[PDB]
Design a protein around this ligand. Structure first.
Ligand SMILES: [Mg+2]
Lengths: 452, 412
DNA sequence: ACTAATAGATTAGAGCCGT
RNA sequence: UGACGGCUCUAAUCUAUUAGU
């Protein structure tokens, strides 16, 4: 008989430091941790796209009721949740003609096609930023379906990448999402039906817009102080790999600071997904210096986690650049071995947060399960748990589980209950997808607002 | 004294608005009395003695609700005795309610507009409350926190009863007590595949590692008759299972690797005699039932082969045996599709698309029952099934998966 | 040293549907 | 690319071992 320990849900801080377990409830009830004065929109689309965007903004002004209000919380309205104003009449609209898109699409070179499609939008964005005195906080790109389907060296990745040197928060919204009712797959019904999940769509879009405009919808507090939760992701370039790091830590005021820690670390090696000692030493020196400048003193622990296992050489380099009094914990999180738990009598999956301890150096954690708070399980099918292995260093296998579960609750790109994989890894993955989509940057911005 | 703000509304529909507003007002230090937040005698009592304001969540149904108009009727009465014209405050929320269908007891009054956005309406409501000098306590998040949890943050509660979870791990009941390293390097003809032997065997170094004995390989491996059965290295498996065995000839890691390879090959071989039809995956081996092999194409009162539109879906499994944490046979569920139940559709995209749609129908219990019934078919004896690795050497697999018990449950 | 084979492992990706 | 999740198809590396160059 195998015993499953349980890890309880962590609490995320909201306005006035009040705690809750669901962003969709904590925000609607309490309000964001930091409030902004308002959001100046910026739209780069057609007249059709501008009309759609204004319609959607005014629609989310009013409360949004989704079909199953009990399982997924309703949307009070943008100003009702966040406390700032987001009007559809303050749009600094920059028109894009379908004809110039058409002449771009007719070019033989696909790489030049996607480069020119990115260039159109980004150059219009740059022109407005440098010419229009109207301050724009977030630029919302209402792209048509032709861009999405004809152009497939990715539109989104390059577009986010080529704006990094100018530091402009952007939000791509395909017109299929905003006008889903009038986008039908010739059957007479929408291509993807948002009817029962309209409120959750409003939640996600509004949260993404609020975050990118300088607001912090919620912050974490249920993590150990003095620890720099650091995540690495490796991305393929074809025979080079590209490491990207994201770091989360508590400050002097006990406020979680979540920021990227990315520097170029390119390794070309037969043995892939490993770092040379120089790259690793750079990596760790950058992270430690960032913690030092944010808090003064050095961390009491460097909780390095990744989807891969570390070899000896890079760990020795890590230890060599590490000062004294600081411990290093290298944790590998894998989601490949199928351990599907079926409940004996019933029809709803295992509760989220259950944890199976293999031994002192490994565990299974069900970061995806059935959450009673929303009554809606995060997985349609049986949820595969994440295998958390303490690859290197000394740690408590339950403490690592609770730390990972806490790190699974800071996805600002979506206002879901919690993320299946820890957020630092997923955001580092997004950074790697973007930072490797254009030319090398001397100093990429360390704020996710520009990436997600 | 009367220091409470009564909130009236339709019971099954206006819950969302009133819940937000009541919690919003409570968070600001007010004392709110809502039926959802908190019998007719009681309702009247508050409106008659406890209530200081009567906020009417007005909508196209709250004015057609017989029980609400009664609360309005008593509210009209109480308003007179208090000599307060500003007692009933008609919060209009419904979009289509436009000041022409209002009930006569509220039409003479000016509403607070919530039709265009709730935030300005709450801004309007608070303005009216202060204009009318309604007293309010400090918005302490303590007693107010209690109401918040009693409403939602107590619901977060996790039922603390014990549940039983059926996984997909099938432990290996038994292994042969000894691992043998035979020598047929001089007896192995060039170009012969070790995979074609009747029993599982792996060619490690200048040897042949298998769980069978020397003479077990005679037809497949020629000249083994002349071979001295003393040309073999013996290794207690339990020693390697504990990791104790680590000689310069072979390490514990490599020996366990060879054990896993033997396990997988033995599973593949037994499936050939078990009469299951094989479908190749990208990096694993799937097994499913040809239509008609089962009685009525179902077993243990659980359908394992069925029909989806023009295609036939076949429940399938793939096995990979692991020694960590402990020796088990990890089984994975799959769905395979055939045209007329005979031959497999040769389009991977079509197979994937058919499965993605078929997956919607099946549930937790549906997958568990199908997996357990499909495994129980493998059973040779009452409570297990054996995998052949030698002439007299068997490995026993529990036909039931490992049970996992948890201290936590939900309402279900 | 360097290629080929048989594995098992460990990681990438590309993809395609569901909600 | 509002999202999340499951799955499917490729691909390489690592390690061991043999073969060959
Ligand atoms: Mg985003």
């Amino acid at each position: 008989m195998k015993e499953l320990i349980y890890i309880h849900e962590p609490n995320i801080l909201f306005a006035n430091g009040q705690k809750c377990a669901d962003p969709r409830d904590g925000l609607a009830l309490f309000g964001p941790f930091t409030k902004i004065y308002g959001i100046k929109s910026g739209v780069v689309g057609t007249q059709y796209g501008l009309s759609i965007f204004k319609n959607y903004i005014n629609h989310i002004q009013k409360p949004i009721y989704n079909a199953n209000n009990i399982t997924r919380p309703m949307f009070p309205g943008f100003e009702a949740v966040f406390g700032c104003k987001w009007d559809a009449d303050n749009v600094v609209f920059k028109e894009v003609t379908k004809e110039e898109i058409e002449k771009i699409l007719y070019t033989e070179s696909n790489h030049k096609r996607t480069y020119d499609l990115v260039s159109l939008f980004i150059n219009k964005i740059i022109t407005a930023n440098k010419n229009e005195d109207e301050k724009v906080d977030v630029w919302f790109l209402v792209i048509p379906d032709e861009i999405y389907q004809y152009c497939r060296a990715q539109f989104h990745d390059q577009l986010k990448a080529r704006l990094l040197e100018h530091t402009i928060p952007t939000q791509i919204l395909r017109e299929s999402t905003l006008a889903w009712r009038d986008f039908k797959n010739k059957f007479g019904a929408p291509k993807r039906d948002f009817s029962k999940i309209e409120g959750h769509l409003a939640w996600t879009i509004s949260t993404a817009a609020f975050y990118k405009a300088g607001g912090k919808p919620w912050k974490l507090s249920d993590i150990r102080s003095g620890v720099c939760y650091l995540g690495l992701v490796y991305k393929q370039i074809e025979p080079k790999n590209a490491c990207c790091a994201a770091q989360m830590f508590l400050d002097n005021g006990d406020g979680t600071v979540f920021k990227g820690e990315v520097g170029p670390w390119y390794n070309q090696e037969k043995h892939e997904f490993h770092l040379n000692p120089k790259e690793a030493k750079a990596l760790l020196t950058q992270a430690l210096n960032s913690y030092k400048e944010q808090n003064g003193v050095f961390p009491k622990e460097i909780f390095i986690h990744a989807k891969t296992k570390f070899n000896g050489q890079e760990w020795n380099a890590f230890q060599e650049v590490t000062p004294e009094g600081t411990n290093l914990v290298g944790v590998t999180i894998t989601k490949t071995k199928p351990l599907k738990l079926f409940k004996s009598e019933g029809n709803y999956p295992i509760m989220r947060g259950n944890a199976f301890i293999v031994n002192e150096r490994s565990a299974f954690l069900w970061t995806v399960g059935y959450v009673p708070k929303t009554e809606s399980t995060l997985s349609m099918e049986v949820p595969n748990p994440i295998f958390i292995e303490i690859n290197k260093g000394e740690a408590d296998i339950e403490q690592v589980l609770k730390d990972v579960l806490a790190l699974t609750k800071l996805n600002y790109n979506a206002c879901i209950y919690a993320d299946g994989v820890p957020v630092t890894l997923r955001f580092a993955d997004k950074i790697g997808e973007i930072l490797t989509a254009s030319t090398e940057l001397k100093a990429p911005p360390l704020a996710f607002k520009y990436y997600i | 004294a009367r220091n409470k703000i009564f909130i009236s509304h339709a019971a099954p529909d206006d819950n969302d608005f009133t819940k937000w507003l009541a919690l919003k007002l409570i968070a600001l230090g007010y004392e709110v009395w809502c039926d959802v937040l908190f019998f007719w005698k009681v309702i009247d009592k508050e409106i008659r003695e406890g209530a200081i304001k009567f906020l009417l969540a007005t909508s196209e149904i709250a004015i057609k609700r017989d029980g609400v108009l009664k609360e309005i009727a008593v509210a009209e009465k109480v308003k007179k005795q208090l000599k307060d014209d500003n007692f009933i405050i008609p919060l209009i929320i419904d979009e289509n309610l436009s000041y022409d269908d209002l009930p006569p007891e509220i039409i003479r009054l000016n509403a607070v507009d919530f039709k265009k956005s709730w935030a300005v309406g709450l801004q309007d409501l608070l303005k009216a409350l202060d204009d009318q000098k309604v007293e309010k306590n400090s918005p302490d998040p303590d007693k107010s926190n209690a109401l918040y949890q009693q409403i939602f943050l107590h619901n977060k509660g996790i039922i603390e009863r014990e549940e039983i979870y059926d996984s997909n791990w099938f432990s290996i009941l038994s292994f042969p007590k000894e691992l043998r390293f035979h020598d047929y390097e001089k007896l192995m003809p060039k170009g012969f595949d070790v995979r074609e032997l009747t029993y599982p065997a792996v060619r490690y170094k200048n040897y042949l590692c298998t769980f069978a004995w020397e003479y077990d390989f005679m037809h497949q491996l020629p000249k083994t008759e002349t071979y001295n059965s003393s040309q073999t290295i013996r290794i207690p498996t339990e020693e390697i299972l504990s990791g104790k065995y680590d000689s310069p000839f072979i390490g514990n890691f490599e020996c366990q690797r060879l054990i896993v390879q033997l396990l997988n090959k033995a599973f593949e071989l037994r499936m050939k005699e078990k009469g299951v039809r094989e479908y190749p995956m990208s990096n694993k081996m799937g097994y499913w039932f040809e239509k008609g092999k089962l009685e009525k194409d179902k077993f243990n009162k659980v359908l394992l082969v069925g029909k989806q539109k023009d295609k036939h879906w076949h429940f399938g499994i793939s096995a990979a045996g692991k020694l960590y944490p402990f020796p088990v046979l990890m089984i994975s569920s799959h769905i395979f599709f055939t045209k007329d139940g005979k031959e497999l559709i040769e389009s991977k995209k079509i197979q994937h698309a058919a499965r993605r749609r078929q997956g919607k129908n099946w549930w937790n219990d549906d997958w568990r029952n199908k997996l357990l019934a499909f495994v129980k078919y493998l059973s040779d004896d009452e409570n297990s099934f054996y995998l052949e690795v030698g002439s007299e050497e068997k490995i026993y697999i529990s036909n039931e998966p490992v049970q996992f018990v948890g201290k936590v449950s939900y309402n279900m």
